């Protein structure tokens, strides 16, 4: 009626009760609190830049239990910290390249970021930086200036810039690098920032190594661009967002070009659209989604969606079960609550990762309830 | 001996009682040999030169204490003492004459307990040996008590070397078994002719079965018998084998949920990290026992309270 | 007349010359500059506390080429950042225990230090802190307060304090933990802080696992303490420092107690004594010392010798060739210049580690010249 | 090819000339086969169906270019192309009739060069075949020039298929070797009977040894000979075997120390990290060559300049 304990154990815990039911309840709570203090992690710094670094340090070149890689990486994806628009579709790139998505100030490369780059890639004075060490700049000069690009080159790294004359051309530059190999692509409107962040984790899900590209299109135009049409070829397209993000005209345009009827995952607002991504069976299976990420929705400010941008690749590759990102600053929507409820198994969730500061307590609490944590 | 094994884990504070039990075991001849280890290394071997000699068993017990008392008493963090205990319950004796007399007085405390009541017209009981003028049974003077059935006391020829033996001697009863006003002759009361001795060979007297009446026949009784000593195995554990005991430098945490003040499950989680599989398996064993009849090693009834045991990996950060 | 180059090589460097001698000179310079930009490291932060952390992060639980250990450690040695006096003899302890020597503020455990502790010991929320994780506090309450000791206990670590009523009793507490197992001990005067730092690397040299203890004694007393006499037993003693640090009286006292004639390694000043430690054949072999550490001498301020304190264990265990510490803030002494010259082989030095900020450039340059770097 | 093995490393910028040399090698029949690899994977094999046919050799050369020209021209970082070259210099031929005639005219430009001067009383030279009335040697009419020794021109039966061959035909000389006024008879001049052909079998004509006079005897000469074609190996490398060539996507850094402006050793160290053992071994090879005359593969004389090659690990941080 006993086992021989390890010599290093700090205590012998004997939990007694007259009633087996009172014991049951205690041991249940113990389990919950044990798992919760173990699997309910917050990954945040004081800045948006620090949050991205925290993500990189935890998940890339890390001994952490849920790390994407334990060895040094060969690729970085860098995004302008303010410019959510330029790097909007960079998450699937970061995923495919086995790279952290880091944020930098536009003018000067942040010393914090420089340090993390050295750490994650294992760059040292005594060791040569061979041509396999690569840094992708997602955005033009207005998001990541030439000054920063030259500073990265000066340290001895190969620097490829994925950019165009506008957000649309820039997205195609990024999407082109990712490649449309699995006959599937995601399309988002120019202003549909939260929508791109809802789908980013899904796009970041790798199948035989390849991520799925996201393309930004002019949602109020008569037609999409020749470049978009050429890139999209004859692939299945899922439009993320409502008519106000990507019009009826654009849907037809994509229909005509591809010759295949595009799907539409959308809601009345950003939180509804986020819920729909989770509810969509193609992206997630009912009662088989255990790992979850939470980040701000960008209702207060749009550029605060960069937390989700940095997190999305990790969410896509997380453990052995891809995770969505729930978008919520102050409050979860009714649609989200439902979505998670149907997504999570009977047993409940096994991982919850809050990304960034300023996410209200009710939100995490609600998530913990829904996941039984 | 090894961390995952079946065996006992004694905390430091209770080392004295644990060693005393091994000493008692050596003295009463339960334990043939104890191999002692300080951490991973074997440092000593305790065994009486001849089990049939009392002095040799006492010598073994003294040596055992002398060896380990300082190591256990001053045990540091990460340090531990393992005892591999070659035992054999069939060799166990009652080596103290005071212990044998303690059983005799335990038996003597039942002397006044009534086994069979005096008979009535409705209910069977004790009747007189001879019937009335009409040829019907009449009630007995007194009830049948334990003092009427047998006397107790230790047998002659016992010793500390070989062991003492509590003995039961059958009495005599003239009164018989029947109903008052019944024509059929009272049935003779069969007194204990067997199970008159008890050496305590790793077993204890089952008082539910010892000196109990056994009426045979049901509605029409034909025979009445009173049992002698009927024993029971004092443990579920095997008669012979080897047992591993380990002392560790850990504090015991008593969590009584029924108490006025106890450590909440939250604060317990806050203080230690538990192995998830250790908990989940314990929880599943509780749920299974609650919902179905399924008993488990993980959950056990001890001292009128259901309990689980956890040896956490370590303390939690912050 | 050529080799098949790696695919990852950034260039093919062909160095040509009409005169083989001009080539010789170029390739010689190349070698020097190549080794120098590789093996001449500075390890410093903005604070003394940060310098110690930098040392820990570089050499303990590190993938660095010259790291003392690549796995997580089980022991920390903590010292009050201002109190050089209390932790004075802690370096050999840190060495023997395979521990970094960290510095903390007296009242509050520094968040920087707390973070490094977690990193170097690999402490995590999801993993149990078993009883093998130990933190030694070298000093009394006036160097490391109870507040800090309780804060370390609260995190889930075993905390043993090595202290006494004064510097002398405290040194014996530390020296007692180290153990006088190899029939040898070092003795320094109460004011001989620089002397203790000169010998600390030597004391930190392990032989069959054990370091050699250092004991502080009252240098102007008639006799050493009963506790010192009891600890020192019948062992060989090397006194470090001149008459003004440890008097003639004390030497006799140690002679009488031990029954063995104590040695004396000393000079007219701290820099001379430092040179003598290097010159002493028992501690270092001529033409076989290639690895060198440099730290401030404490002439400007005595407490600035904490850099040497933190470095000394690493110096003792460095690579496969123990290193001394040269004590010099603004300038090397004549004795030091000579000492290194005789110490270094014909080939020159192979490692130079500057520890801390305010070491003058001439010093490092001189060292680089002496070591042919 | 494999990293660090013996073989050639061509930078991207020079891929065109490298492939042209392989093409020329295929055309002139130096190269029997080339196995091509894009990165680690073998993608193609170039070889003429029959080496004796010109068309087949040209076809091989065209195929080689067609295969690799896009891969090499657009070579990305980390990518490389390896050529395993089965060669045999003995099979090498002169495929152009213009090249053969260029050698003939090169030989014909020596026709007027005097090999042996007319004899004097002091110095040995050319004398007449018959002595004067008194029985002493008399000076020859003309000196011995190259035109007197042999005529040049390409041999009949040559073709682009099999190859052309420059031929030397020995002349005739009546005049002999001696001193004027000497009684001993002039020594017969041995004209070239061997080395009359030159096909260019991986060799070039050594003009220091070709058509040179070889007087035997010293003070008292006994024999005089004029050599035919004496060749020299145009490269130090073996006649037959297999060689590995690798193109990489790296920039070439020419560091000429004799130039007005070059990269200082400091700035070079600042820009790249070099393997210490790669340098030390190179330095030791230079010192050894400087002090002791010991030659090495690591340091070599090329175009009147001593050079070393370094392939650094990568660029240096900061």
Numbering used by the authors:
A (entry chain B), C (entry chain D): 2 to 374
B (entry chain A), D (entry chain C): 1 to 318
From the study:
The surfaces of most bacteria and archaea are covered with a proteinaceous coat, the surface or S-layer, which is formed through the self-assembly of individual protein subunits into a regularly spaced, two-dimensional array. In C. difficile, the S-layer largely consists of a major S-layer protein, SlpA, which assembles into a paracrystalline array enveloping the cell. The major protein of the C. difficile S-layer, SlpA, is post-translationally cleaved into two S-layer proteins (SLPs): the high molecular weight (HMW) and low molecular weight (LMW), herein referred to as SLPH and SLPL, respectively.
Our H/L structural model reveals three distinct regions: a pseudo-threefold symmetric SLPH tile, an intricate LID/HID interacting motif and a third region composed of two domains, D1 and D2, of SLPL. These regions define two separate planes, with the SLPL spanning ~35 Å above the SLPH plane, linked by the LID/HID motif. The three CWB2 motifs form a triangular prism and adopt an intertwined fold, with a β-strand from one CWB2 inserting into the neighbouring domain to complete a β-sheet (β2H in CWB21 completes CWB23, strand β6H from CWB22 inserts into CWB21 and β10H in CWB23 is inserted into CWB22) sandwiched between two α-helical regions. The environment- and cell-facing sides of SLPH exhibit considerable charge differences, with a mostly negatively charged external surface and a largely non-polar cell wall-facing base, decorated by positive patches. The 2D lattice is achieved by tiling of SLPH, with interlocked ridges of SLPL molecules covering gaps between the tiles, creating a tightly packed layer. As hypothesised, the p2 symmetric 2D lattices of native S-layer ghosts (a = b = 80 Å, γ = 100°) were consistent with unit cell parameters of the stacked lattices in the 2D plane of the X-ray crystals (b = 78 Å, c = 80 Å, α = 100°), pointing towards a similar packing. In contrast, tiling of SLPH and the SLPL ridges generate a compact lattice apart from two distinct pores in the C. difficile S-layer array. Pore 1 (cyan arrow, between molecules 1 and 3) is ~20 Å across the widest point at the environment-facing surface but is partially occluded by the LID/HID motif narrowing it down to an 11 Å wide cavity.
